[PDB]
Design a protein around this ligand. Structure first.
Ligand code: A89
Length: 298
């Protein structure tokens, strides 16, 4: 895994000073320094013929080096491409698969990937539309008992539960070609603002704990990656994964490093963290969590 503790991990005390010494504008500049870095890798597959129509945004391709390949087949008008990237987690290879919000023409590709990669948990951090901007297609049966067919794969809703900041849906995927069934849990975070970033990270971190527990429980009953997506699969996705990694390190060694985590993540899911606000949010969220845990003395 590219996500190892250090070199130069930072403690909460050191993190406080680092942020004080820099302020909001400082952290904003730090984000621009990262954004200025030339991506490490290439994007030839994502921009090649036949795969262009599979990208929601022409300006958000995925890296060749880490793309998730679909074990497709010969002469049947299709490629092995899906805009999705394997992403490491804290001391864990391929902890997540960061991908864009499925398009009607890639719903089948999305579910095939879920099947082949043995995914048990899917995390969606957007609504289908926000501010008039389309962000994700309705790729799963919304209500209990309804089902959708994608070739030799059938997806059925076994139940839905609405929480204050997220919705949990249990889905059963039936691969009729291999005569096997699997239950997948789908979580849709509902508290990410249409504009800016959450004013408090409490909801997102609690949600992170919900997802971690479900993954742990599913894996125990079955590690496969957790699919995490937002419209382009880089902003909210990158934020969710970066926080998960930093928090993990913080719980194990009491240290972390936002700059390293984001820079490292950007070598697997290109462009992870789309705005300075989101970058700043990663720092602020960690400090807010620190205070809530009674670790901060002002
Ligand atoms: C020129 C062009 C732009 C867009 C677009 O609107 N892009 C959006 C895509 C996007 C990205 C992130 C989000 C998000 F953060 F909300 P999420 O949480 O759902 O992930 C939503 C939507 C955008 O803002 N574009 C970004 C682009 C990101 C960086 N890319 C590049 O610039 C780039 C492209 C190719 C090669 C190289 I080297 C770099 C921007 N402009 O801020 C689409 C088609 C075309 Br043609």
């Amino acid at each position: 895994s590219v996500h190892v503790p250090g070199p130069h991990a930072m403690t909460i005390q050191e993190l406080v000073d680092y942020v004080n010494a820099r302020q909001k504008q400082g952290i904003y500049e730090e984000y621009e320094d990262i954004r200025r870095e030339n991506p490490v890798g290439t994007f030839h597959c994502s921009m090649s013929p036949g795969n262009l129509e599979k990208n929601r945004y022409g300006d958000v391709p995925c890296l060749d080096q880490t793309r998730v390949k679909l074990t497709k087949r010969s002469g049947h008008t299709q490629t092995d491409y899906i805009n999705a990237s394997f992403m490491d987690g804290y001391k864990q290879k391929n902890a997540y698969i960061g991908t864009q919000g499925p398009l009607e023409n890639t719903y089948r590709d999305f579910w095939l990937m879920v099947w082949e990669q043995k995914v048990l948990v899917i995390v969606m951090t957007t609504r289908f539309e926000e501010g008039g901007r389309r962000k994700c297609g309705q790729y799963w049966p919304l209500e209990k008992d309804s089902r959708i067919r994608f070739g030799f794969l059938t997806v059925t809703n076994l139940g839905v539960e609405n929480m204050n900041h997220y919705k949990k849906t249990t889905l059963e995927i039936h691969n009729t070609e291999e005569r096997q069934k699997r239950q997948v849990t789908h979580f849709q975070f509902l508290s990410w603002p249409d504009y800016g970033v959450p004013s408090s990270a409490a909801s997102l971190i609690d949600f992170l704990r919900v997802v971690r527990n479900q993954q742990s429980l599913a894996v125990s009953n079955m590690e496969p990656p957790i699919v995490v997506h937002c419209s382009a699969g880089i902003g909210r996705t990158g934020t969710f994964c970066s926080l998960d990694i930093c928090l993990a390190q913080l719980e194990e060694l009491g240290t972390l490093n936002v700059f390293q985590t984001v820079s490292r993540m950007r070598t697997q899911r290109a462009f992870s963290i789309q705005t300075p606000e989101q970058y700043y949010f990663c720092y602020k969220a960690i400090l807010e969590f620190a205070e809530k845990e009674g670790m901060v003395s002002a």
